[PDB]
A paper describes a structure:
The type VI secretion system (T6SS) is a machinery widespread in Gram-negative bacteria and dedicated to the delivery of toxins in bacterial and eukaryotic host cells. The phage tail-related syringe-like tubular structure is composed of an internal tube tipped by a spike-like complex, wrapped by a contractile sheath and tethered to the membrane through contacts with components of a trans-envelope multiprotein complex. This membrane-associated complex is composed of the TssL and TssM inner membrane proteins and of the TssJ outer membrane lipoprotein. By combining interactions with inner membrane and outer membrane-associated components, the TssM protein crosses the cell envelope and is therefore central to the T6SS membrane complex. Nanobodies were raised by immunization of llamas with the purified periplasmic domain of the EAEC TssM protein (TssMp).
Two nanobodies, called nb02 and nb25, were selected for further studies based on their high affinity for TssM and on their amino-acid differences in the variable regions, suggesting they bind distinct regions of TssMp. The two selected nanobodies, nb02 and nb25, sharing 77% sequence identity, were produced in the periplasm of E. coli, purified to homogeneity and concentrated to 10 mg/ml. Both nb02 and nb25 behaved as monomers in size-exclusion chromatography and both crystallized readily, allowing to solve their three-dimensional structures by molecular replacement. The superimposed structures of nb02 and nb25 differ by a rmsd of 1.13 Å on 118 aligned residues. However, despite identical lengths, the conformations of the nb02 and nb25 CDR1 and CDR2 regions differ significantly. More importantly, large differences can be observed on the CDR3 regions, notably in terms of size (14-residue long for nb02, 19-residue long for nb25). Analysis of the SPR curves indicate that nb02, nb25 and nb42 bind to TssMp with KD values of 66.8±2 nM, 1.61± 0.1 nM and 1.76± 0.1 nM, respectively. Due to the 50- to 1000-fold magnitude differences between the KDs of TssJ and that of the nanobodies to TssMp, we expected that the occupation of the TssJ binding site by the nanobody would prevent TssMp binding to TssJ. Fig. 3 shows that the TssMp-nb02 complex can readily interact with TssJ. The formation of the nb02-TssMp-TssJ ternary complex demonstrates that TssJ and nb02 bind TssM differently. The control nanobody and nb02 had no—or little—effect on the function of the T6SS as 17–2 cells producing nb02 released the Hcp1 protein and retained anti-bacterial activities at levels comparable to that of wild-type 17–2 cells. Because of the formation of an nb02-TssMp-TssJ ternary complex, nb02 is an interesting tool to assist the crystallization of the TssMp-TssJ complex.
Residue numbers in the entry: 1 to 130
Write the structure that this text describes.
């Protein structure tokens, strides 16, 4: 019956940073491995990052590795996704997911629990010089 809620989405200029959080209900949070997934406008959802029960093991999607960092704080029942040097291609609704039994890269369909999603828009001022 674990409930997940993401926060932190917003409109950011390219090169900008953004920090997302995903908080879980109850106090059995350490029993869950978590992941971040994202859905770009009208596309299939893709893997972003994953973190094990103890933050010991982490995985990143190839398009985000090095720019993004996933972390966890058991005292705040939360996982975070720190995004640096954002690109227009990072525009998506970001979702967090939880599972008591599996951790690793990908495995979207494996996760048992899902958040609501938080929107991340990476946009310039749309100024065109011709």
């Amino acid at each position: 019956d674990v409930q997940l809620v993401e926060s932190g989405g917003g409109l950011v200029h390219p090169g900008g940073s953004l920090r997302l959080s995903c908080a879980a209900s109850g106090r059995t949070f350490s029993d869950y491995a978590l992941g971040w997934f994202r859905q770009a406008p009208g596309k299939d959802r893709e893997f972003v990052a994953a973190i094990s029960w103890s933050g010991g093991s982490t995985y990143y999607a190839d398009s985000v590795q090095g720019r993004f960092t996933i972390s966890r704080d058991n005292d705040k029942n939360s996982v975070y996704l720190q995004m640096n040097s954002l690109k227009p291609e990072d525009t998506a609704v970001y979702y967090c997911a939880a599972d008591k039994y599996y951790t690793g890269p990908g495995g979207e369909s494996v996760y048992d629990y899902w958040g609501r999603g938080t929107q991340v828009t990476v946009s310039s001022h749309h100024h065109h010089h011709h």
